[PDB]
Structure 1
Amino acid sequence: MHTAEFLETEPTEISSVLAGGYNHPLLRQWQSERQLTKNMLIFPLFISDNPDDFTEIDSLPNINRIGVNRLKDYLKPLVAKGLRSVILFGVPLIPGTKDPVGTAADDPAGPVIQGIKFIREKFPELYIICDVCLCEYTSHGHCGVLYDDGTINRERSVSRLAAVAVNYAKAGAHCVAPSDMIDGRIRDIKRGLINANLAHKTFVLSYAAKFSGNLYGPFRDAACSAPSNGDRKCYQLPPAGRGLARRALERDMSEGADGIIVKPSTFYLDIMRDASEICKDLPICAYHVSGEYAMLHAAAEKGVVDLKTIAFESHTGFLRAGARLIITYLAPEFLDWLDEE
């Protein structure tokens, strides 16, 4: 009958033996090129036009649209648990606010500058990062200023973004993160910071490799950011575009970026690996996007995977791919889990 066959074997070659290095829990930690800490997390905030808001973003699980009068109460516990940095997103809901040139982007009375001022006052230890773009302030919803045909107007756009970025810094933001993907904007923003004598104190965190895609769905709802006048495929990198992303990282670093962001994250981990060699001397940051975030929550509610587990796996994945920073909506969770782990 059928019996278990066992082939004759030669002695074990030492080169085949990797096992001695990961047979214990501690060894699996010794094995990571980088360990996850609380200071590597950056939590995004969607600041509202209505100071009393604390609105539910149905498509973005456990994330709200917070007004300034509701900020101290929200941030107090996070900061008490170790939060070190936040990234501001403005959501001006007052009518009449939006226009073709994103005028309200740097409005001193707008949510962003208002949130910056509030934070520097009630939380002077928090590191403030401000996303820099016009999508949330333009009536057309696109990332920059358009020509009449509907296409983006590079020089006028970068000219505008540069101003917004300097204005945020002038207001007190420690860092500026342009996520517009428009050619040459980093150079203009850096030059603008230098002319304002703010470049020696403003970190420029560029979204150097930001891809077009099906993963920004819930963020559009939270920032009321959806475009009008098509897709964003002309400035956002195509998903298969690895050469463009590689040339965009070299460009941005050359133009002054002090750090880079890869976005999305899980779906673009190989891109983080590339940036790790090209921008080896700068901090790399992974952005765990709204759609990657809600995809983890759905699969988890479906029983497919376990939230905490897959969150740790995915997040250590960023650090493995080369990132040392992470912008993620799971920050409140991690600020808790890291106490234990």
Structure 2
Amino acid sequence: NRAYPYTRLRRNRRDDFSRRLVRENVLTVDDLILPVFVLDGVNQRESIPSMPGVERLSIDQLLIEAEEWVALGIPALALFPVTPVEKKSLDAAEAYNPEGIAQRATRALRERFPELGIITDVCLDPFTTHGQCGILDDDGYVLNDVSIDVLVRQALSHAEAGAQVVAPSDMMDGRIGAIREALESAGHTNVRVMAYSAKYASAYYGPFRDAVGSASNLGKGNKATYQMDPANSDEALHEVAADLAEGADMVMVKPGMPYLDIVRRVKDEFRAPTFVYQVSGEYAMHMGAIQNGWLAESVILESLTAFKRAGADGILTYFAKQAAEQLRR
């Protein structure tokens, strides 16, 4: 029965102090996870035109840049290897190579910065000639259970390299449980699995596929037989429920802003650690507008606050350093 003029919702908005007192959500640097593109080789830095301000870095350069991310208090990185063209195959075997970019980078960072969280990407897409997330059958379909076998091998290799978190981004059915049972069997008791539970078949991923070099491989291919239809919301709940039952420690929605309603439903329904990826296309859209002078730089913290408001525990964001810098000030 709250009614104007007895209730005037502007009163608490009248002054900064009262806005601070009634503020429902506060972003902190504990919320930020930085994705990073990792090159092979030494002393390599490469700009990405469709992700202004982000560079692909060789491992040596990554370790230098990480000093600052650690100093800013960024809790974790999510690694994305930029696989050389020659290491792509039909069998995706590079995925489980102990000397692959991801495994080498993990061992280097685990050594150098023991408190920094490392989240490796469990997916075959960086490793396939065709750019799909799994192994194809003779009809061109991404086979579910054969792909899981490879994913398992990959996840184990990551655990062996020391990754504290493996994040399967593949959208195969059942892979969380398969990976978890493999980790348990092998004694990797405490390796976290951060499931990409509700990962949509989106147009927002284009810049990332440029950054990692899978755009050329995928071409005009699509992923509608495994990634979720953008139209579907209830389905995301079923996806998350399975992954929690299968042993996920964290669950993720991807993409992010375009799916904030999904974040809120998933947090409300399961009350579990819930993450969201502000993907490459989201970063690119915002950057582009900022550098054109169309949007003020304040939009960065507004975009991130939205995820917090929608119920996210943490956010994978290419803005993590920028944001950490602003928050610290």
**Common topology (TM > 0.5):** yes
Contact 2:83 2:127 in 1 (8 A): yes
C-alpha displacement at 1:128, in angstroms? Answer: 0.8
C-alpha displacement at 1:228, in angstroms? Answer: 4.9
The one-letter code matched in structure 2 to 1:217 is G
Contact 1:117 1:171 in 2 (8 A): yes
Cα 1:320/1:115, change in 2 over 3 Å? same
Please identify, of 326-335 and 219-228, the stretch whose mean Cα deviation from structure 2 is larger.
Answer: 219-228
Cα 1:17/1:185, change in 2 over 3 Å? same
Cα 1:289/1:338, change in 2 over 3 Å? same
Gaps of 5+ in 1: 1-10
Runs of at least 4 residues off by over 6 Å: none
- The residue matched to 1:105 in structure 2 has which SS? helix
Cα 1:299/1:195, change in 2 over 3 Å? same
C-alpha displacement at 1:125, in angstroms? Answer: 1.4
Q: Distance in 2 between matches of 1:258 and 1:60?
A: 30
- Identity in percent: 38
Q: Establish whether residue 336 from structure 1 lines up as the match of residue 312 from structure 2.
A: no
Match of 1:4 in 2: none
Contact 1:97 1:104 in 2 (8 A): yes
C-alpha displacement at 1:23, in angstroms? Answer: 2.4
Match of 2:131 in 1: 141
Q: TM-score, length-normalised on structure 1?
A: 0.91
C-alpha displacement at 1:333, in angstroms? Answer: 0.4
Cα 1:12/1:35, change in 2 over 3 Å? closer
After TM superposition, list the pairs within 5 Å mapping 1:228-239 onto structure 2.
228=219, 230-239=221-230
1:295 to 257, 260, 285: 285
- Alignment: residue pair count: 325
After TM superposition, list the pairs within 5 Å mapping 1:242-253 onto structure 2.
242-253=233-244
Q: Distance in 1 between matches of 2:242 and 2:139?
A: 27
Q: Distance in 2 between matches of 1:65 and 1:125?
A: 23
Match of 1:164 in 2: 154
Match of 2:99 in 1: 109
C-alpha displacement at 1:41, in angstroms? Answer: 0.8
The one-letter code matched in structure 1 to 2:229 is P
Q: Distance in 2 between matches of 1:63 and 1:239?
A: 27
Contact 2:52 2:288 in 1 (8 A): no
Q: Establish whether residue 173 from structure 1 lines up as the match of residue 167 from structure 2.
A: no
Q: Which has the higher contact order (CA 8 A, sep 6+)?
A: 2
Please identify, of 22-31 and 32-41, the stretch whose mean Cα deviation from structure 2 is larger.
Answer: 22-31
C-alpha displacement at 1:12, in angstroms? Answer: 4.8
Gaps of 5+ in 2: none
Q: TM-score, length-normalised on structure 2?
A: 0.94
Q: Distance in 2 between matches of 1:177 and 1:33?
A: 30
The one-letter code matched in structure 1 to 2:119 is I
What is the root-mean-square deviation in Å for CA atoms of aligned residues?
Answer: 1.6
Which protein shows a greater Rg? 1
Q: Establish whether residue 314 from structure 1 lines up as the match of residue 303 from structure 2.
A: yes
